[PDB]
PDB file of N, CA, C and O in Angstrom:
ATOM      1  N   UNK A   1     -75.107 -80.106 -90.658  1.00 31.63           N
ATOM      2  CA  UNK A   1     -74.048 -79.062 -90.713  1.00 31.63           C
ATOM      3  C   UNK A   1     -74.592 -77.702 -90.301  1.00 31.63           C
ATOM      4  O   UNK A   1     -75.784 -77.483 -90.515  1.00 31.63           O
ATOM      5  N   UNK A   2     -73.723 -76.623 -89.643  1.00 34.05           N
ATOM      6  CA  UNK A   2     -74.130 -75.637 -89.578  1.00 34.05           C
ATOM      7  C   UNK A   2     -72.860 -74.485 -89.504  1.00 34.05           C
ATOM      8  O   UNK A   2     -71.875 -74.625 -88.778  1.00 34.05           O
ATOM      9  N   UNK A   3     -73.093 -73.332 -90.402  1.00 36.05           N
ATOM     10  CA  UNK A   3     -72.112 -72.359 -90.685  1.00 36.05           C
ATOM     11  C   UNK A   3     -72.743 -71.194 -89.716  1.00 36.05           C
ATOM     12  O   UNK A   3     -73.958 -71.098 -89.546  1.00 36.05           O
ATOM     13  N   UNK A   4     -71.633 -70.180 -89.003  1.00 37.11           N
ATOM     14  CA  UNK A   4     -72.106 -68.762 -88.659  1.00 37.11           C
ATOM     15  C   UNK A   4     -71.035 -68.103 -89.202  1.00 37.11           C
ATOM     16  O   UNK A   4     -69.942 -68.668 -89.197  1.00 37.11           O
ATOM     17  N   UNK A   5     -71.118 -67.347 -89.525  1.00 39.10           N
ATOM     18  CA  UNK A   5     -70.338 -66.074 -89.927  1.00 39.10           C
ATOM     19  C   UNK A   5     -70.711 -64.810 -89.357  1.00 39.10           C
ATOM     20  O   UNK A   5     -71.707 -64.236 -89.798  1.00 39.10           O
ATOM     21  N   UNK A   6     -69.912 -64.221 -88.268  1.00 37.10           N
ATOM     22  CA  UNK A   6     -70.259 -63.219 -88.208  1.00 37.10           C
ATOM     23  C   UNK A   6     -70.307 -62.747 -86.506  1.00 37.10           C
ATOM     24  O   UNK A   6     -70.681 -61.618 -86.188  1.00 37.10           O
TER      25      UNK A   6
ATOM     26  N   UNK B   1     -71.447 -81.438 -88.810  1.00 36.00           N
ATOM     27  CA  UNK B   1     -70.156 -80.278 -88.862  1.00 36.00           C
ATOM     28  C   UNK B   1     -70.513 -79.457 -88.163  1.00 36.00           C
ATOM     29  O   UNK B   1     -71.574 -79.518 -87.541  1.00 36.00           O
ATOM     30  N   UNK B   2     -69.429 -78.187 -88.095  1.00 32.84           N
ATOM     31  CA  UNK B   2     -70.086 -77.173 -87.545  1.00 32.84           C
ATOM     32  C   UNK B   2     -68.789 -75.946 -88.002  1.00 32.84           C
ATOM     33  O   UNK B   2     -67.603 -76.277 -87.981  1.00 32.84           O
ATOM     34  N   UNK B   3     -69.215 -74.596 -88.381  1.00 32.33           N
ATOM     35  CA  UNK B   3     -67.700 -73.769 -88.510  1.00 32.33           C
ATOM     36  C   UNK B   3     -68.806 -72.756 -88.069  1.00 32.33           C
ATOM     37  O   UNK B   3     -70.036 -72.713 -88.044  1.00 32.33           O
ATOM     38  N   UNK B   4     -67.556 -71.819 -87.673  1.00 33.75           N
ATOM     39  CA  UNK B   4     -67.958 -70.671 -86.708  1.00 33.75           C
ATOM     40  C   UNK B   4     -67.099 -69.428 -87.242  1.00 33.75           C
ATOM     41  O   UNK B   4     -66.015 -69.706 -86.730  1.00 33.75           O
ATOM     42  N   UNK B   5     -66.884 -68.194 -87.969  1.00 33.39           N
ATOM     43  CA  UNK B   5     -65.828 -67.606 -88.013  1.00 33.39           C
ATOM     44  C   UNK B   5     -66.453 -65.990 -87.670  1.00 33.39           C
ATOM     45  O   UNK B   5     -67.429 -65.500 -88.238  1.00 33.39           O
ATOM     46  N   UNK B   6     -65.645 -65.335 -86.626  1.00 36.76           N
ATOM     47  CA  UNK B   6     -66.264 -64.313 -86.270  1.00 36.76           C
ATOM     48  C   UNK B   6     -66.065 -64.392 -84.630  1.00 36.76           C
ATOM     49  O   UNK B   6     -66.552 -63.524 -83.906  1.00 36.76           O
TER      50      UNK B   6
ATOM     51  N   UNK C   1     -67.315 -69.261 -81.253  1.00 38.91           N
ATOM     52  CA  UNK C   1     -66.847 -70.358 -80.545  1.00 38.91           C
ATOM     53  C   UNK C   1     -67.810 -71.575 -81.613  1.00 38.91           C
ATOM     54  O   UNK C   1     -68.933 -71.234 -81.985  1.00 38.91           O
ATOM     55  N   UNK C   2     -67.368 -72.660 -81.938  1.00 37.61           N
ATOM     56  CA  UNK C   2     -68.497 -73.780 -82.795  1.00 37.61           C
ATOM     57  C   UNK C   2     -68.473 -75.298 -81.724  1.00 37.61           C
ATOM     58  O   UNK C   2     -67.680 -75.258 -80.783  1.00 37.61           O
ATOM     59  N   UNK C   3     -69.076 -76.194 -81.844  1.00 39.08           N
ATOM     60  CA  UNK C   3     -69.818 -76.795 -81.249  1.00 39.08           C
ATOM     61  C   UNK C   3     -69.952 -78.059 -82.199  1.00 39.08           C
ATOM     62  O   UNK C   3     -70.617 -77.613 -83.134  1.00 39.08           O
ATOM     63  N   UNK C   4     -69.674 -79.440 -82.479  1.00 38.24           N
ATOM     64  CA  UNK C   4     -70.544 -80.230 -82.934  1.00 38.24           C
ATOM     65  C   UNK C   4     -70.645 -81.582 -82.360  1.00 38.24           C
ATOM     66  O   UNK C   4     -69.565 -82.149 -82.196  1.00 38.24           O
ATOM     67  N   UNK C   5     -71.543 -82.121 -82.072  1.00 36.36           N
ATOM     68  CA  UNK C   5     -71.819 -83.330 -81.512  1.00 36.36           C
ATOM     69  C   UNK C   5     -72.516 -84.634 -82.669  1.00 36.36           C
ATOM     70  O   UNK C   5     -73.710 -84.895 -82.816  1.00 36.36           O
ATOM     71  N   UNK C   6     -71.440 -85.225 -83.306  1.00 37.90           N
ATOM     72  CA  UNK C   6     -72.147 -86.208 -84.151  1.00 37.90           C
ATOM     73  C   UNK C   6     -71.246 -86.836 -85.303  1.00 37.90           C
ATOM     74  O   UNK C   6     -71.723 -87.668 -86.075  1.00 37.90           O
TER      75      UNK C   6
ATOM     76  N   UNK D   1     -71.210 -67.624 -82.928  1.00 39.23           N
ATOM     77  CA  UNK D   1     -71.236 -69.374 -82.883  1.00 39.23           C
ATOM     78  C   UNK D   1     -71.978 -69.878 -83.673  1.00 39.23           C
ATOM     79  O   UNK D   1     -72.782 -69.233 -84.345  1.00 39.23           O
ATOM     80  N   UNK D   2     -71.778 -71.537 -83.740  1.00 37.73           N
ATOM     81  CA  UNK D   2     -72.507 -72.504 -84.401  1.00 37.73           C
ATOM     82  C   UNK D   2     -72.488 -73.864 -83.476  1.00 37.73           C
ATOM     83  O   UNK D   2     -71.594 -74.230 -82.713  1.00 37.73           O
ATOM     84  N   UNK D   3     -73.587 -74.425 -83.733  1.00 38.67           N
ATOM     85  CA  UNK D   3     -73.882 -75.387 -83.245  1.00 38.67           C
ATOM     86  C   UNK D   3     -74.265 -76.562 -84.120  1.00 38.67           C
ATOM     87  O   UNK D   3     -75.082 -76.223 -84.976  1.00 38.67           O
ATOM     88  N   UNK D   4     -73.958 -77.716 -84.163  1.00 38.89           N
ATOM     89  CA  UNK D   4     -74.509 -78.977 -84.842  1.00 38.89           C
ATOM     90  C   UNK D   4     -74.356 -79.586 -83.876  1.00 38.89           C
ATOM     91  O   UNK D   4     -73.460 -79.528 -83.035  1.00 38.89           O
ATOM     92  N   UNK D   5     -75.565 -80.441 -83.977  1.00 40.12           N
ATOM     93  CA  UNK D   5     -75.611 -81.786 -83.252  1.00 40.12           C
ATOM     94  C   UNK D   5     -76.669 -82.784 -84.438  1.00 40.12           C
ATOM     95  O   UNK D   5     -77.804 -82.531 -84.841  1.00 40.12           O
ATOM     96  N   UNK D   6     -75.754 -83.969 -84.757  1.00 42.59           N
ATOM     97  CA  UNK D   6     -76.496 -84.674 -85.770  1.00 42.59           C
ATOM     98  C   UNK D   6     -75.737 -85.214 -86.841  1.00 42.59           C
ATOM     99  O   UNK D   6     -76.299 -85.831 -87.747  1.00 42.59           O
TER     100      UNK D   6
ATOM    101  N   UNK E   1     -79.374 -78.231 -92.474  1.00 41.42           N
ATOM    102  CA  UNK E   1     -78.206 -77.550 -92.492  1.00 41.42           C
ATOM    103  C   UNK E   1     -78.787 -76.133 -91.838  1.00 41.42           C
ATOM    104  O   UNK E   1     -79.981 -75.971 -91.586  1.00 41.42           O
ATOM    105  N   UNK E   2     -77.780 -75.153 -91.610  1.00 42.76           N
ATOM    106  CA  UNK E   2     -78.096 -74.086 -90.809  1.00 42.76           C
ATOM    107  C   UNK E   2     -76.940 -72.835 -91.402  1.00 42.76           C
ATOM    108  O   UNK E   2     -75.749 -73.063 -91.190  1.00 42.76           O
ATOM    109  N   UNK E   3     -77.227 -71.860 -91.953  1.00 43.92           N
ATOM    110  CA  UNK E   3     -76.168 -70.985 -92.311  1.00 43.92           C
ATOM    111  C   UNK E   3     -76.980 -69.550 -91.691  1.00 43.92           C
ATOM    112  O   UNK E   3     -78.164 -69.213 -91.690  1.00 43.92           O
ATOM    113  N   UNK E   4     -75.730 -68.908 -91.180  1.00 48.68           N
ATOM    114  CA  UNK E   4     -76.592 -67.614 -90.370  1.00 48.68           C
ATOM    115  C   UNK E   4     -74.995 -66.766 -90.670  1.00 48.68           C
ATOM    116  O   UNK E   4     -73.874 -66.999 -90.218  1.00 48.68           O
ATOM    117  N   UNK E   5     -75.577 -65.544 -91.786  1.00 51.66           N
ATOM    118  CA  UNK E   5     -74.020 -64.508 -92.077  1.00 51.66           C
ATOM    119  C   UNK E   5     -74.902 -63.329 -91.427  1.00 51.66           C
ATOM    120  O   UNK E   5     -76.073 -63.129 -91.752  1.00 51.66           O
ATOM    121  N   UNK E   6     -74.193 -62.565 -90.460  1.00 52.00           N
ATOM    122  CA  UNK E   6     -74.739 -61.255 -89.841  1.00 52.00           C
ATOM    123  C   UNK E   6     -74.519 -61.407 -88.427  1.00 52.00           C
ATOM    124  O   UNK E   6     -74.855 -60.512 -87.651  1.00 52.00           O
TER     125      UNK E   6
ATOM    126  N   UNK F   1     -75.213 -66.493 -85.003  1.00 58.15           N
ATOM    127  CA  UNK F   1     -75.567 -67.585 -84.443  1.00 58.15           C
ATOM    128  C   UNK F   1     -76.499 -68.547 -85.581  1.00 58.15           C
ATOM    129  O   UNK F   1     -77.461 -68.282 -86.303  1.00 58.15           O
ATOM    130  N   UNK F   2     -75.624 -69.886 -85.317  1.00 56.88           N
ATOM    131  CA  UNK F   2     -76.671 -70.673 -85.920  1.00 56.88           C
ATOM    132  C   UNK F   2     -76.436 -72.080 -85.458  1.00 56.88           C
ATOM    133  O   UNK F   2     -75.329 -72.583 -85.260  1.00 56.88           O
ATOM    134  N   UNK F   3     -77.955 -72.833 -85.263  1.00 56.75           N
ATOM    135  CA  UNK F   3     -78.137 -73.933 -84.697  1.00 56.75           C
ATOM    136  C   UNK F   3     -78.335 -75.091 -86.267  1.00 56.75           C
ATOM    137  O   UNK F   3     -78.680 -74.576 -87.330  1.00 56.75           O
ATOM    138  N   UNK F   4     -78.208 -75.813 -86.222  1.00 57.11           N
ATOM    139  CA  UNK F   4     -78.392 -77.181 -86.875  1.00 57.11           C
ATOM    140  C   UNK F   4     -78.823 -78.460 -85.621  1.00 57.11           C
ATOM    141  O   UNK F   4     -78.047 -78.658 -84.686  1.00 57.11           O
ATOM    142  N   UNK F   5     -79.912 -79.121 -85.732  1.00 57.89           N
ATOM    143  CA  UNK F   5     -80.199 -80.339 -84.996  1.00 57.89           C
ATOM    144  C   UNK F   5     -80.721 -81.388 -86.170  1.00 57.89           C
ATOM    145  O   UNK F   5     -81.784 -81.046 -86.689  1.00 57.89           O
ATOM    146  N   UNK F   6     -80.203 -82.461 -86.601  1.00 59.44           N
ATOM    147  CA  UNK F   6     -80.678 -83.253 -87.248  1.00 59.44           C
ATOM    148  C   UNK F   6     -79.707 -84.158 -88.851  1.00 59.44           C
ATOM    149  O   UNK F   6     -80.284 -85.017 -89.518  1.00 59.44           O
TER     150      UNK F   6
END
């Protein structure tokens, strides 16, 4: 999994 | 997965 | 933009 | 962005 | 896993 | 930006 925010 | 917000 | 392959 | 592969 | 906020 | 491989 991978999240970015921003 | 993958989420992206931005 | 997100991306996942899998 | 984000990316997964996996 | 991969989380990147900034 | 964020990568995840695996």
């Amino acid at each position: 999994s991978s999240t970015n925010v921003g």
